[PDB]
Amino acid sequence: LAHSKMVPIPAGVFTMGTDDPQIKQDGEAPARRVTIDAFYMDAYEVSNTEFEKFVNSTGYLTEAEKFGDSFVFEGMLAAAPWWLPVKGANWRHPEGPDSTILHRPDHPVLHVSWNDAVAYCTWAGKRLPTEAEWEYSCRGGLHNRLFPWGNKLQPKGQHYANIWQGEFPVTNTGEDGFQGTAPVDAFPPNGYGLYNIVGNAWEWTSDWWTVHHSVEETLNPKGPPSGKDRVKKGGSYMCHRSYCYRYRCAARSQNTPDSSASNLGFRCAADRLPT
Ligand SMILES: *[C@@H]1O[C@H](CO)[C@@H](O[C@@H]2O[C@H](CO)[C@@H](O)[C@H](O)[C@H]2NC(C)=O)[C@H](O)[C@H]1NC(C)=O
Ligand SMILES: [Ca+2]
Numbered sequence: 001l002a003h004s005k006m007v008p009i010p011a012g013v014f015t016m017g018t019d020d021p022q023i024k025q026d027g028e029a030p031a032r033r034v035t036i037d038a039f040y041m042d043a044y045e046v047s048n049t050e051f052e053k054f055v056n057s058t059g060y061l062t063e064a065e066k067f068g069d070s071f072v073f074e075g076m077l078a079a080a081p082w083w084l085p086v087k088g089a090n091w092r093h094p095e096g097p098d099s100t101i102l103h104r105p106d107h108p109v110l111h112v113s114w115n116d117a118v119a120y121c122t123w124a125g126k127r128l129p130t131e132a133e134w135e136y137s138c139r140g141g142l143h144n145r146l147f148p149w150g151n152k153l154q155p156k157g158q159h160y161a162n163i164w165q166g167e168f169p170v171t172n173t174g175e176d177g178f179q180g181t182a183p184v185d186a187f188p189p190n191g192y193g194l195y196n197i198v199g200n201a202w203e204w205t206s207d208w209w210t211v212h213h214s215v216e217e218t219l220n221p222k223g224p225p226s227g228k229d230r231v232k233k234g235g236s237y238m239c240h241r242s243y244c245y246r247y248r249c250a251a252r253s254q255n256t257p258d259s260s261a262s263n264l265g266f267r268c269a270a271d272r273l274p275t
């Protein structure tokens with residue numbers, strides 16, 4: 001269990017975005033050439049256990065605990081009728097008060113806000129990645145592919161990510177081996193050595209959200225200087241093509257920095273290795 005290990009992501013130039021946006025409302029277009037300096041990125045989503053080390057040390061009280069509620073998928077018991085705001089739903093109690101994390105220590109932490117994530121990473125001698133670092137990393141050395149691994153969803157007939165199978169929201173067949181979340185080290189790594197960069201839990205980035213992008217070539221871009229929503233990436237175990245096709249590197253979405261929910265977590269990046 002090296003669930004806080006990092007990988008060196010190589011310096012390089014890449015196509016961020018796409019001239020074939022499958023969800024236009026989200027600012028997937030235009031494709032634009034971005035240059036990214038070499039850095040490090042968590043190989044894994046931050047796990048319940050890793051977060052607990054953080055909380056052991058600092059006594060950090062997450063925002064869901066402070067507000068007293070968080071968003072849980074009805075399916076496992078508001079932005080959709082299936083998102084319910086549940087009292088005493090937080091990272092220790094992912095589906096509300098009578099749920100627990102004891103049987104799932106290696107699964108990614110949930111019900112953490114952008115602030116929670118930042119407190120963790122900075123605690124950890126790290127920081128959140130920018131969207132561009134995230135997306136570049138997601139792509140995993142490949143150019144203009146849908147997914148970290150290519151354009152087939154199940155290559156060689158194999159599940160490569162934790163998402164929805166079946167009729168959403170009513171039936172999740174769990175064909176891919178998991179109905180909710182999966183251990184942070186489940187499924188194959190992309191070419192850069194990252195696990196579950198699409199699927200499992202959504203992932204916070206450091207950028208404010210905008211849908212307005214130039215084709216101006218940029219270098220280590222931080223997104224806009226302001227916003228009201230922060231950028232999240234890579235879909236979750238609830239994604240399906242039929243209604244939410246965001247288990248692609250190009251896809252993107254947003255939340256206010258103080259939101260939290262049962263399919264949303266994070267991982268850290270860093271310019272240089274921490275201790
Ligand atoms: C966070 O702190 C708690 C409490 O100090 C740790 O749990 C204890 O660990 C010791 C040593 O393994 C055991 O003898 C006890 O059985 C535990 N006590 C309790 C209160 O359950 C816990 O391991 C820490 N969590 C993490 C992720 O490091
Ligand atoms: Ca699944």
Ligand SMILES: [Ca+2]
Nearest residue numbers: 196197199201
């Ligand atoms: Ca993920």
